[PDB]
UniProtKB/Swiss-Prot annotation:
Location relative to the cell: Periplasm
Binding site for Cu cation 1: H73, H405
Binding site for Cu cation 2: H75, H113, H460
Binding site for Cu cation 4: H402, C459, H464
Keyword Signal in annotation: yes
Disulfide bonds: none
Cofactor list: Cu cation
Role this protein plays: Multicopper oxidase involved in copper homeostasis and copper tolerance under aerobic conditions. Is responsible for the oxidation of Cu(+) to the less harmful Cu(2+) in the periplasm, thereby preventing Cu(+) from entering the cytoplasm. Probably primarily functions as a cuprous oxidase in vivo. In vitro, in the presence of excess copper ions, exhibits ferroxidase and phenoloxidase activities. Fe(2+) is an excellent substrate in the presence of excess Cu(2+), but is inactive in the absence of Cu(2+). Oxidizes the phenolate iron siderophores enterobactin, 2,3-dihydroxybenzoate (2,3-DHB) and 3-hydroxyanthranilate (3-HAA). Oxidation and thus inactivation of enterobactin could protect cells from the interaction of enterobactin with copper and play a central role as an interface between copper detoxification and iron homeostasis.
Protein name: Multicopper oxidase CueO
Record-level GO cellular component terms: outer membrane-bounded periplasmic space; periplasmic space
CDD domains: CuRO_1_CueO_FtsP, CuRO_2_CueO_FtsP, CuRO_3_CueO_FtsP
The EC number(s) this enzyme carries: 1.16.3.4
Length: 476
């Protein structure tokens, strides 16, 4: 049979009352011909793309039609803690919460997802994620590819696994608390290996790694390059040509790729050096989507310059914050042993060369920052507002992958896991790799966050977050 077409999320803008309505609910999806219960925003799975303009406010009405509590966080958006939608932003089942977002950051592809305390990994795995497209006056002047669903398309890449009855097989247990929840089935905007028909010329892909725990590495099947034009927080100063593009959980990149008549090619993901993630079929390059060229000219441009990136400021005298990530050694050892027992040596491919003892030994609070599993009631510190700070995040002590994300900001990486950042990672980012080493970022918070609606800083391997690798912090 033919491949399904790539689903395109609807691009949603405000009504005359300046409102956007988002309903959170459960329904059914089909994978490989089997029904599964799934959750979506304005539908059964995934969500729309909310379109925002710098310097304009919009109000979002969010209706929770699940039978459990949830929250809605705008990952990548710089907004006050009161509307950030972290764990304290509870929407009761059957209830509604509204937030007004005063957009004040450059054009970028952001996203939105639940942040329910202890349950973010399950709620994302069940289907909840959406996109945010921020525009400003500067980006439209570039005449980039801009026809949504034609030559400007979002690509949300996620894995799942399913039980024999067809349902999503999600579990937060000792194994996934150590290495993450991952599966054997790859979805692209919710579909299995779709095709996208694109006009001749440049195709813009807005890539999101929406996996709970799997890192990805994008490339093309015939080795045509990808031109990175933007990272998590917006445009790079000029395009950066790459042959492969690693993308950590929750990160976005926008790339341009050439489309030529008569030569279909796949976007693929290459095997990564992360524990568990190279089990067949991910031990080999894995298709993400087929690009099918159409003999109609695409009008978008790849300009030589995209934007102005300010210099880093002097670092001397800035507040230096230390964030030590850690995992309980026993539960790290127990979860890695269960991974190895299940899959064998292949669970470490590509890597470098039982009784109840009480609540003190519960894996649900085994992962930590600065010696503490996440305490919703006690922000760990008060950061300055309007001031640059150097945050130093260490994963020394274990070898798991921790894509570390800080709410309320777009930062600049100074060191990524002990090395200067790659050029396409040197601009605006909201995630930094931490893996067995130390990262340092330059952050500034433009908005307040009080104790009651604090900002989060956390590993975005969701099963680590949910078992304690998160802290709250206030601003102002
Ligand atoms: Cu996120
Ligand atoms: Cu976030
Ligand atoms: Cu982690
Ligand atoms: Cu978050």
């Amino acid at each position: 049979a033919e491949r399904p077409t790539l689903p395109i999320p609807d691009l949603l803008t405000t009504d005359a009352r300046n409102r956007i309505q988002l309903t959170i609910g459960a329904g059914q999806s089909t994978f490989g011909g089997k029904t599964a219960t799934t959750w979506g925003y304005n539908g059964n799975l995934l969500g729309p793309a909310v379109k925002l303009q710098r310097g304009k406010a919009v109000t979002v009405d969010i209706y929770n039609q699940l039978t459990e509590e949830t929250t809605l966080h705008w990952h990548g958006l710089e907004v006050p803690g009161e509307v950030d939608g972290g764990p304290q932003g509870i929407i009761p089942p059957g209830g509604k919460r509204s937030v007004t977002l005063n957009v004040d950051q450059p054009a970028a592809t952001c996203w939105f997802h639940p942040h329910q305390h202890g349950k973010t990994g399950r709620q994302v795995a069940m289907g909840l994620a959406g996109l945010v497209v921020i525009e400003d006056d500067e980006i439209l002047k570039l005449m980039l590819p801009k026809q949504w669903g034609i030559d400007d398309v979002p690509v949300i890449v996620q894995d799942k696994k399913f039980s024999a009855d067809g349902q999503i097989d999600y579990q937060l247990d000792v194994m996934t608390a150590a290495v993450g929840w991952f599966g054997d089935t790859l979805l692209t905007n919710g579909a299995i290996y779709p095709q996208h028909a694109a006009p001749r010329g440049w195709l813009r892909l807005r890539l999101l790694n929406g996996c709970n725990a799997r890192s990805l590495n994008f490339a093309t099947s015939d080795n045509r390059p990808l031109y990175v034009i933007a990272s998590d927080g917006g445009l790079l100063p000029e395009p950066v040509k790459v042959s492969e593009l690693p993308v950590l959980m929750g990160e976005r990149f926008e790339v341009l790729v050439e489309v030529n008549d008569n030569k279909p090619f796949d976007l693929v993901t290459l095997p990564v050096s992360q524990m568990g993630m190279a089990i067949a079929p991910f031990d080999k390059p894995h298709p993400v989507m087929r690009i099918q060229p159409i003999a109609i000219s695409a009008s978008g441009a790849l300009p030589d310059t995209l934007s102005s990136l300010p210099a880093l400021p002097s670092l001397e005298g800035l507040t230096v914050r230390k964030l030590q990530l850690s995992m309980d050694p026993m539960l790290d050892m127990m979860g890695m042993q269960m991974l190895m027992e299940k899959y064998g040596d292949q669970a470490m491919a590509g890597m470098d060369h039982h009784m109840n003892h009480g609540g003190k030994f519960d894996f649900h609070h085994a992962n930590k920052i600065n010696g503490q599993a996440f305490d919703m009631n006690k922000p760990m510190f008060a950061a300055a507002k309007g001031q640059y700070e150097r945050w130093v995040i260490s994963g020394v002590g274990d070898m798991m992958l921790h894509p570390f994300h800080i709410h309320g900001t777009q930062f600049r990486i100074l060191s990524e896991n002990g090395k200067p950042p790659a050029a396409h990672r040197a601009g605006w980012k909201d995630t930094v790799k931490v893996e067995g080493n130390v990262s340092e970022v330059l952050v500034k918070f433009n908005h307040d966050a009080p104790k009651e609606h604090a900002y989060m800083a956390h590993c975005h391997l969701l099963e680590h977050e949910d078992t304690g690798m998160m802290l709250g912090f206030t601003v102002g």
